[PDB]
């Protein structure tokens, strides 16, 4: 319940990708399914993701962190990529299930 | 009789082959039936 | 047995014939097509025709393709300027599955952005393949020249619209034209109760006549292509009649008087009045025939000729003169009887194939209200008199004419010169 | 001094003006263009215009390019529908050098297969660059629609002819159109005897009065291009008088009555009757002027309108109504006088530049075979009466219409609807 | 005058820049001047 929410928020703060302005779905490993999901993103979301990732890379190059008020809040972190990734994974699972028989 | 196939020649003027998906189009009665014979 | 007809309360037509054939073929004829596009969404019907295998709310693209192929069935889309037919063919033991796919494709599409964007190039590929033969482009230009509002729209997406057909346009077109009243579910090798049940299951939604198409207006212009080919294809038509009416039968009999089909392979087209009329004047390889298009709003009757670039004009003149000869009352009764026999035999052979019979029944259910037996159609053809054919020829001669040519065009006449 | 105009025995016309300017400019105007192409050599004039730096009998392509660029000179070809003007401009001392190059380009061309084949793609590149602005496409369609032949040919090679212009066609064109009686050699900053000597040295081999094209036959058709652009460009014209006649002066005065173009940057074009007539009912971005093409055998006068896609019909009808009102006699003497002032000022400004003066003298030598002082041109301009302008407007209103449109169309009328 | 240059707009509609070779074409008065006033 609220205990799980508290530990999840603590972990989100500890995993400092919000300190770089990134969102959770910007840090996922770009395997084949994630690449296909990115390919299906609408143009605005793709551009926003590209800029956020580039800014994070610049910050890590300078070994610096975004101002405290610019960190991505846990409650306002939107999982934009999750639906597309889920759809791609379902399609892959369907293809594999067909291949089994 | 109400198809665009008023005369059999002409309709099906252009239609692509296919399996499980094969679009086709139908213009109206046209020529190029005996065109091949002459030359 | 006998074809069974039904009109559901929402307006959907259902026709079922049980010929006990090993293969069942089910079509869904929707009163969509190019004529129901406007200037802002040209080519939408082309992408819709190409997008039968895309993902639907019920089944995915992969599922649709694999499931249809597994039972060896075929899913096809045939689109004219006033109708789109989605037909599924397979062995009768496994028809229900295909029906679901069919009734998904036309009732719960999704038009996912990435799928449509991938499909865009297929528009150009299909257009190029179709235009590989000159008749397609010549007839597209002929419809563009003859009509101005609705039927002028081409069966193929315009070049500037290849990458611009958005999923929203496809959704709007489907929601406004794939309606219950605009649909008819025909089936060969199926029982009426099953067809009715599946229609209730899927085609219950999207009722009403849908978005109404604008009445076709006759332009009477001309379009010249100038593609530099040795052979010139020239079509010269005039507003003939609407399908179904007695004028349509008169124009059909007139077309078979002039001579449409080749009949005897490598033949001199002796019965074909146009071919023999042109032959005595032009000795180069030409080939000519009579064009006859019938639509709900209007129709176009005329002469379609192929000719050598140098002599093309002469050919057209000769052909035109021949029709004038018919228009002046020079029409033998034996010629009319032979044309009626040819028309009746051609119609009977058209509905011989399951494809032809299904398309005929779908067109009758969509344009008309019920299905008319072939005997009544033959009676209508017989009722046509010589005076009616002469009047049709007179109407073609007098009416303002639209022309479309493609070739060298150095010696091809203009409409005014005809 | 004044212009030294002279006609050579072979028919060549040489004119020279010594204005003592530091720069010297020599042009060779030839009565060759798209008008003098047939259906089999369409695009030949385009490639010929693009082929001014190919290898010749006297100099090679490398030699021509390096020699012209070394002295800083410029060689350009301006090809209108019925004329083609080569011109080399450089400093007064080096002009002689360029002169040779010029007369090697025209008198003794040498089209080598490899060079022409390499040049072929330049046709596509140049046509794309030209068609970047819609006015070019609309005008090509307008000339195709208005005329059946001659002037119907476009200034640019057809797409199907891009890679099919053989060197033999270029040689035939040059031989049959680059003849002495069809040429004129005009010079600024060049002494007359030197120009005569160079003309004798080069422009004597080819006998005059080459192959002559047919008279352009007015068609009065229509060509509507659906390209989905937000702005619709429409041109509605009718056959006006040929150049050099009094009625041509009347048509030009009428054009400046309606308004040829703005005289104030970002101005409202208050004196433009067409602009004010359209503005009264159209509150969207629009532009309307009077199109006036004057050719040797015929001419076109009409209205050119750029408008919104949904408001094109309103703009076209408003401009046509204004022209009709002028035709009925609603033309004030003050307006005619103002239009005459605009015409005289525009002509003097056009001939004010070296390029303008050169092209004006070349056109006069190629059409009338003689030079007319600007005072005589002004006297002819002011000799137009209000009655003449009203009659020209009547001729436009009561004449066969040819229209070319490009844009989203949909709300753009047809020639019959006007 | 006997040139297609009837008004400042139209003629020289499509003239490409160049040096030692610069083809140009000239149609007739085709408006579009003062069109840029509004988008």
| Secondary structure tally for chain A: helices H, strands E | 4, 0
Contact: chain C with chain E (3+ CB pairs below 8 Å):
no
Helix (H) or strand (E) holding C82: none
Q: Flag whether residue E19 sits within 8 Å of chain D, measured between CB atoms.
A: yes
Residues 6+ apart with CB under 8 A from C36: C45, C150, C173, C177, C211, C213
List alpha helices for C87-158, DSSP H. Answer: 95-105, 113-131, 134-146
- Token pair belonging to D330: 């609603």
Of C160, C164, C226, the CB nearest to D158: C226
Q: Do D75 and E31 touch (CB under 8 A)?
A: no
E20, E36, E37: best to mutate for the D interface, most D CBs within 10 A: E20
Cα separation, C253 vs C246, in Å, equals 11
DSSP D251-279: HHHHHHHH-SS-SSTT---TT-HHHHHHH
DSSP H helices, C178-272, are 192-202, 246-258
Rounded CA Rg of chain E? 12
Rounded CA-CA distance D134/D278 in Å is 21
Residue A92: partners with Cβ closer than 8 Å, 6 or more residues away: A33
CA-CA-CA-CA torsion sign (B23, B29, B35, B37): positive
Closest by Cα among A84, A17, A88 to A52: A17
Handedness of CA D105, D106, D107, D113 (dihedral sign): positive
Residues D393, D394, D396: CA angle, nearest 5 degrees: 65
**Chains in contact with B, counting 3 or more C-beta pairs less than 8 Å apart as contact:** C
Neighbors of chain A with 3 or more C-beta pairs under 8 Å? C
Q: For D23, phi and psi rounded to 5 degrees? A: -95, 145
Helices C333-350 and C386-398 meet at what angle, rounded to 10? 90
Rounded-to-integer distance, Cα D48 and Cα D165, Å: 10
Question: Looking at chain D from residue 134 to 153, which residues have their Cβ under 8 Å from any Cβ of chain E?
Answer: 135-136, 138-139
| C350, C330 Cβ separation under 8 angstroms | no
CB contact under 8 A, B30 and C130: no
CB contact under 8 A, B3 and C359: yes
**Cβ separation C228–D160 shorter than 8 A:** yes
Calculate Rg over the CA atoms of chain D: 22
Burial per residue of D122-149, b for 16 or more beta-carbon CB atoms within 10 angstroms, e otherwise? ebeebbeebeeebbbbbbbbbbbbbbbb
Rounded distance between C-alpha atoms, residue D138 and residue A100, angstroms = 60
Q: Does A36 touch chain C (CB under 8 A)?
A: no
Resolution in angstroms, to 1 decimal, for this deposition?
Answer: 2.8
Q: Are D174 and D41 in contact (CB under 8 A)?
A: no
Q: What is the DSSP string of D195-217?
A: HHHHHHHHTTSS-SS---PPPPP
A68: number of Cβ within 10 Å: 7
Pairing of strands D222-226, D401-407: parallel
- Tokens read off for C133: 């033969």
Taking the CB of residue B5, how many other CB atoms lie within 10 A of it? 24
Read out DSSP for D145-208? HHBSSGGGS-SS--GGGTT---HHHHHHHHHHHS-GGGEEEEEES--HHHHHHHHHHHTTSS-S
**CA C248/CA D312 separation, integer angstroms:** 37
Segment holding C360, helix H or strand E: helix C354-367
CB atoms within 10 A of CB C230: 11
Which technique was the structure solved with, according to the deposited record?
cryo-EM
The CA distance from C229 to D39, in Å, is 11
Q: Give the closest residue to D81 by CA, choosing from C226, C410, E25.
A: E25
List, in order, residues 6 or more apart from C282 with CB less than 8 Å away. C307, C311, C314, C315, C318
Query: What residues of chain D lie within 8 A of the CB of E17, using their CB?
Result: none
Ramachandran quadrant class, D319 (left: phi over 0; alpha: psi -120 to 50; beta: rest):
alpha
User: What are C25's strand-pairing partners?
Assistant: C89, C188
Instruction: Read off φ and ψ for residue A9, nearest 5 degrees.
Output: -65, -40
Token code pair at residue D2: 């004044």
B7:C52 CB<8 A:
no
- Which of E7, E33, E35 lies closest to D346 in CB terms? E7
Per-residue tokens: D187 = 């010079």
Decide if D362 contacts D187 (C-beta within 8 A).
no
User: What is the rounded distance in angstroms from the CA atom of residue D253 to the CA atom of residue D339?
Assistant: 6
Give D287→chain C minimum CA distance, Å: 23
Q: Which helix (H) or strand (E) holds D345?
A: helix D333-352
User: D119 by DSSP, 3-state: which?
Assistant: helix
Tell me if there are at least 3 CB pairs under 8 Å linking chains C and A: yes
C222-224: strand order across its sheet? C222-224, C401-406, C231-239, C299-308, C288-294
Closest residue by Cα to residue D274 from D322, D233, D339, D344: D322
In what side-by-side order are the strands of the sheet with D183-188?
D4-7, D13-17, D183-188, D23-30, D83-91, D74-80, E24-26, E14-15
Question: How far apart are the CA of D107 and the nearest CA of chain C, in angstroms?
Answer: 30
D238 exposure class (CB count in 10 Å sphere: 0-12, 13-18, 19+): buried
Q: Is D196 exposed, middle or buried (0-12, 13-18, 19+ CB in 10 A)?
A: middle
Residue E17 in contact with partner chain D when CB distance is under 8 A: no
Do the Cβ atoms of C307 and B39 come closer than 8 Å? no
Task: Name the DSSP class of D250.
Answer: H
Are D158 and D182 contacting, i.e. CB atoms less than 8 angstroms apart?
A: no
Q: Which residues of B touch C77 (CB under 8 A)?
A: 21-24
- D407: closest chain C residue by CA: C39
Phi-psi region of C404 (alpha: psi -120 to 50; beta: other; left: phi over 0): beta
Please name which of D26, D38, D1, D44 lies closest in space to residue D85, comparing C-alpha atoms. D26
Is C38 near chain D, with CB under 8 Å?
yes
- Which residue in D has a C-alpha nearest to residue E13's C-alpha? D136
| Residue D213 forms contact with C (CB below 8 Å) | no
**The tokens 């229509």 sit on which residue?**
D222
Q: Residue C290 and residue C281: Cα distance in Å, rounded?
A: 18
Q: Does C309 touch chain B (CB under 8 A)?
A: no
- Judge whether D291 and D279 are in contact, CB under 8 Å: no
- Cα separation, E19 vs D68, in Å, equals 9
CA distance D301 to D292: 5
Measured between beta carbons, the chain E residues lying within 8 angstroms of D54 are none
Q: Residue C223 gets which letter from DSSP?
A: E
> Smallest Cα–Cα separation from C206: which of C31, C5, C64, C89?
C31
State the smallest CA–CA distance between residue A41 and chain C in angstroms.
9
Measure D187 CA to nearest chain E CA, in Å: 17
A91 touching chain C per CB within 8 A: yes
Q: Do A94 and C62 touch (CB under 8 A)?
A: yes
Cα–Cα nearest to D139, from D158, D122, D125, D152: D152
CA–CA distances in Å: residue C366 to residues C2, C72, D158: 19, 29, 43
In angstroms, the CA C318 to CA C316 distance is 5
D89's CB contacts (< 8 A; 6+ apart) are D23, D24, D25, D26, D73, D74, D354
Q: CA–CA separation, D180 vs D377, rounded Å?
A: 27
| Calpha distance D183→D271 (Å, rounded) | 41
User: Within an 8 Å CB–CB cutoff, is residue D87 touching chain E?
Assistant: no
Which positions in chain C have a beta carbon within 8 angstroms of at least one beta carbon in chain A?
A: 60, 62-63, 66, 112-114
Size of interface D-E (CB pairs under 8 A): 173
């Amino acid at each position: 319940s609220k205990w799980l929410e508290g530990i999840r928020k603590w972990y989100y703060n500890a995993a400092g990708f919000n300190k770089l302005g990134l969102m959770r779905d910007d840090t996922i490993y770009e395997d084949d399914d994630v690449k296909e999901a990115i390919r299906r993103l609408p143009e605005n979301l793709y551009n926003d993701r590209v800029f956020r990732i580039k800014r994070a890379l610049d910050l890590t190059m300078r070994q610096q962190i975004l101002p405290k008020e610019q960190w991505t809040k846990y409650e306002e972190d939107k999982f934009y990529l999750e639906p597309y990734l889920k759809e791609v994974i379902r399609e892959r699972k369907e293809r594999e299930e067909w291949a089994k028989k | 009789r109400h198809v665009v196939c008023r005369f059999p020649l002409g309709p099906f003027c252009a239609g692509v082959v296919g399996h499980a998906a094969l679009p086709a189009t139908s213009e109206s009665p046209v020529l190029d039936a005996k065109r091949s014979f002459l030359c | 047995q006998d074809l069974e007809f039904t009109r559901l309360p929402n307006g959907l037509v259902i026709a079922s014939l049980e010929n006990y054939a090993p293969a069942s073929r089910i079509g869904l004829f929707i009163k969509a097509g190019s004529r129901y596009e406007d200037s802002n969404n040209l080519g939408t019907s082309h992408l819709l025709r190409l997008a039968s295998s895309l993902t639907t709310k019920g089944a995915s693209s992969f599922k649709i393709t694999r499931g249809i192929e597994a039972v060896g069935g075929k899913l096809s889309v045939t689109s004219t300027r006033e109708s789109m037919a989605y037909t599924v063919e397979c062995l009768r033991d496994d028809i229900e599955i295909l029906m679901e796919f069919l009734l998904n494709v036309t009732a719960a599409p999704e038009f996912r952005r990435w799928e449509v964007a991938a499909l865009q190039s297929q528009l150009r590929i299909d257009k190029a393949v179709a235009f590989q033969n000159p008749q397609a482009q010549v007839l597209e230009n002929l419809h563009a020249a003859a009509y101005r509002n609705a039927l002028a729209n081409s069966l193929y997406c315009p070049d500037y619209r290849i990458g611009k057909v958005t999923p929203d346009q496809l959704h709007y077109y489907v929601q406004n034209h794939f309606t219950s009243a605009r649909m008819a579910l025909i089936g060969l090798g199926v029982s009426h109760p099953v067809l009715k049940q599946v229609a209730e299951r899927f085609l219950n939604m999207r009722g009403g006549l849908g978005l109404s198409g604008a009445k076709a207006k006759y332009r009477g212009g001309e379009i010249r292509d100038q593609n530099g080919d040795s052979l010139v294809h020239a079509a010269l038509v005039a507003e003939s009649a609407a399908t179904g009416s007695a004028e349509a039968n008169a124009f059909s009999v007139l077309q078979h008087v002039l001579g449409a089909g080749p009949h005897v392979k490598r033949g001199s087209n002796a019965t074909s009045s146009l071919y023999q009329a042109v032959a005595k004047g032009v000795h180069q390889p030409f080939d000519v025939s009579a064009f006859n298009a019938s639509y709900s709003d209007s129709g176009l009757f005329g002469i379609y000729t192929i000719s050598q670039a140098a002599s093309a004009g002469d050919v057209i003149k000769s052909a035109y003169d021949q029709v004038k000869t018919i228009a002046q009352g020079n029409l033998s009764n034996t010629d009319v009887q032979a044309a009626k026999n040819k028309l009746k035999a051609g119609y009977l052979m058209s509905v011989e194939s399951s494809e032809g019979f299904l398309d005929e029944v779908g067109s009758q259910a969509l344009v008309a209200g019920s299905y008319v037996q072939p005997s009544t159609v033959l009676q209508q053809i017989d009722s046509v008199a010589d005076a009616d054919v002469i009047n049709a020829a007179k109407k073609f001669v007098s009416g303002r004419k639209s022309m479309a040519a493609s070739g060298n065009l150095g010696h091809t006449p203009f409409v005014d010169e005809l």
